[PDB]
């Protein structure tokens, strides 16, 4: 598999400085130009810069919005590529991608990675409260029950939720978090046969990564 | 200073219609020397990162359905969707690498659908939040189209307008439906006064709302 992981996202304070990371590996990486864009929530991608290859030897360009206050580098020893970023402001919230750019006729991003979120706030980390949400007195004939978690309170983004550890991926909704006086709150259903549940186990697991926040949430009756 | 543009922002196609979309390049994208148009072509599915689909103008990434066509040269571009598919929900964003690279505004593709009736769910505070000294009511709307929906609360026969968050998911990259979550949260104190919660969702599909409830005393 060529794989491309980024790493370095989290919470970070106006005119602040935070570097990015990305993990490369199962390709040639000298052999590459590597990118990295971003995309603000609900917003439009946008090319950041690149970093050439050892053929063009490694000379970097970037965009006229963030030259002078982002670098890119790389590292050639472990094929790991590098954003470092300052006098972070607002507008930089984002998720940032790293991509596997250009090799010398190729013209195309053929792979990115799954992205890091960056958060630039005043706002202090807060964990979620996790809950569960059971059905109260329904004559549970459907033949589908339905589930919840309400995650609650938190920041900065992202949440992950699963339902048994991935095992149950039909059926579930997560819905997109909701921020409400500087706190984030989100939601997630799953819809099992009423076949099985109660008599089969149903657990919510959450991740908090701002906070090493892991939670795996039984839903009992 | 190369601007990328495209149209329309957003439009909605039924399954096996054909979509086709635009951009623009505020300069040309042919290289005189290569003679290549520049231009890529990304699909974003919800939640994803984008994938390309399509590169100089016209060549298909490979794994890429017939169904997707790039034509186009010099400032002008157009991705065509033939026989679309539900699993063709996403933004398209073109890109342009003539000089660096610039991805234009994107291109929001909804699939339209057959009407659906929500399914509607309620939720009671669990015994863990309230212990907290907060109480969250949920309510959950799911595998609705339209997405077009009203949710009103009702505490004891009547509306409750304060204390409510609602968010919708993006639509469902199978069925091409949409779901809803309203909570609505008081204090334990607020809660504890009052014996029957109402969520009350209002779809064109039906001409009364469809009513899920629950009484506190049969908690
Ligand atoms: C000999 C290196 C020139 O290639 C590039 C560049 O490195 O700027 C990268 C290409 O992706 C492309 O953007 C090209 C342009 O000159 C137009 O093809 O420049």
Same mark, same amino acid.
């Given at each position: 598999?060529?794989?491309?992981?980024?790493?370095?996202?989290?919470?970070?304070?106006?005119?602040?400085?935070?570097?990015?990371?990305?993990?490369?590996?199962?390709?040639?990486?000298?052999?590459?130009?590597?990118?990295?864009?971003?995309?603000?929530?609900?917003?439009?991608?946008?090319?950041?810069?690149?970093?050439?290859?050892?053929?063009?030897?490694?000379?970097?360009?970037?965009?006229?919005?963030?030259?002078?206050?982002?670098?890119?580098?790389?590292?050639?020893?472990?094929?790991?590529?590098?954003?470092?970023?300052?006098?972070?402001?607002?507008?930089?919230?984002?998720?940032?991608?790293?991509?596997?750019?250009?090799?010398?006729?190729?013209?195309?991003?053929?792979?990115?990675?799954?992205?890091?979120?960056?958060?630039?706030?005043?706002?202090?980390?807060?964990?979620?409260?996790?809950?569960?949400?059971?059905?109260?007195?329904?004559?549970?004939?459907?033949?589908?029950?339905?589930?919840?978690?309400?995650?609650?309170?938190?920041?900065?983004?992202?949440?992950?939720?699963?339902?048994?550890?991935?095992?149950?991926?039909?059926?579930?909704?997560?819905?997109?978090?909701?921020?409400?006086?500087?706190?984030?709150?989100?939601?997630?259903?799953?819809?099992?046969?009423?076949?099985?549940?109660?008599?089969?186990?149903?657990?919510?697991?959450?991740?908090?990564?701002?906070?090493?926040?892991?939670?795996?949430?039984?839903?009992?009756? | 200073?190369?601007?990328?543009?495209?149209?329309?922002?957003?439009?909605?196609?039924?399954?096996?219609?054909?979509?086709?979309?635009?951009?623009?390049?505020?300069?040309?994208?042919?290289?005189?020397?290569?003679?290549?148009?520049?231009?890529?072509?990304?699909?974003?599915? @919800?939640?994803?990162?984008?994938?390309?689909?399509?590169?100089?103008? $016209?060549? +298909?990434?490979? /794994? !890429?359905?017939?169904?997707? %066509?790039?034509?186009?040269?010099?400032?002008?571009?157009?991705?065509?969707?033939?026989?679309?598919?539900?699993?063709?929900?996403?933004?398209?964003?073109?890109?342009?690498?003539?000089?660096?690279?610039?991805?234009?505004?994107?291109?929001?593709?909804?699939?339209?659908?057959?009407?659906?009736?929500?399914?509607?769910?309620?939720?009671?505070?669990?015994?863990?939040?309230?212990?907290?000294?907060?109480?969250?009511?949920?309510?959950?709307?799911?595998?609705?189209? @339209?997405?077009?929906?009203?949710?009103?609360?009702?505490?004891?026969? $009547?509306? +409750?307008?304060? /204390? !409510?968050?609602?968010?919708? %998911?993006?639509?469902?990259?199978?069925?091409?439906?949409?779901?809803?979550?309203?909570?609505?949260?008081?204090?334990?104190?607020?809660?504890?006064?009052?014996?029957?919660?109402?969520?009350?969702?209002?779809?064109?599909?039906?001409?009364?709302?469809?009513?899920?409830?629950?009484?506190?005393?049969?908690?």
């Amino acid at each position: 598999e060529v794989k491309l992981v980024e790493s370095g996202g989290g919470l970070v304070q106006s005119g602040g400085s935070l570097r990015l990371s990305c993990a490369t590996s199962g390709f040639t990486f000298t052999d590459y130009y590597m990118s990295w864009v971003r995309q603000p929530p609900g917003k439009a991608l946008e090319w950041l810069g690149f970093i050439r290859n050892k053929a063009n030897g490694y000379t970097t360009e970037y965009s006229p919005s963030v030259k002078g206050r982002f670098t890119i580098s790389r590292d050639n020893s472990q094929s790991i590529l590098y954003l470092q970023m300052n006098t972070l402001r607002a507008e930089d919230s984002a998720t940032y991608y790293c991509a596997r750019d250009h090799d010398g006729y190729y013209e195309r991003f053929s792979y990115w990675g799954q992205g890091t979120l960056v958060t630039v706030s005043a706002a202090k980390t807060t964990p979620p409260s996790v809950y569960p949400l059971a059905p109260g007195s329904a004559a549970q004939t459907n033949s589908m029950v339905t589930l919840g978690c309400l995650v609650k309170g938190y920041f900065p983004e992202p949440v992950t939720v699963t339902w048994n550890s991935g095992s149950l991926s039909s059926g579930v909704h997560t819905f997109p978090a909701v921020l409400q006086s500087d706190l984030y709150t989100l939601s997630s259903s799953v819809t099992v046969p009423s076949s099985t549940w109660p008599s089969e186990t149903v657990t919510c697991n959450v991740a908090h990564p701002a906070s090493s926040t892991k939670v795996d949430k039984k839903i009992v009756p | 200073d190369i601007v990328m543009s495209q149209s329309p922002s957003s439009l909605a196609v039924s399954a096996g219609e054909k979509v086709t979309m635009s951009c623009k390049s505020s300069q040309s994208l042919l290289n005189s020397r290569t003679r290549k148009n520049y231009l890529a072509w990304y699909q974003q599915k @919800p939640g994803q990162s984008p994938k390309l689909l399509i590169y100089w103008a $016209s060549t +298909r990434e490979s /794994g !890429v359905p017939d169904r997707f %066509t790039g034509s186009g040269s010099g400032t002008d571009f157009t991705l065509t969707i033939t026989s679309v598919q539900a699993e063709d929900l996403a933004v398209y964003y073109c890109k342009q690498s003539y000089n660096l690279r610039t991805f234009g505004g994107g291109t929001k593709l909804e699939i339209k659908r057959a009407d659906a009736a929500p399914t509607v769910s309620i939720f009671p505070p669990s015994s863990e939040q309230l212990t907290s000294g907060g109480a969250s009511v949920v309510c959950f709307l799911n595998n609705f189209y @339209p997405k077009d929906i009203n949710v009103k609360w009702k505490i004891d026969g $009547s509306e +409750r307008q304060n /204390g !409510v968050l609602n968010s919708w %998911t993006d639509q469902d990259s199978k069925d091409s439906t949409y779901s809803m979550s309203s909570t609505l949260t008081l204090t334990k104190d607020e809660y504890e006064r009052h014996n029957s919660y109402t969520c009350e969702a209002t779809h064109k599909t039906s001409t009364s709302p469809i009513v899920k409830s629950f009484n506190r005393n049969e908690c």
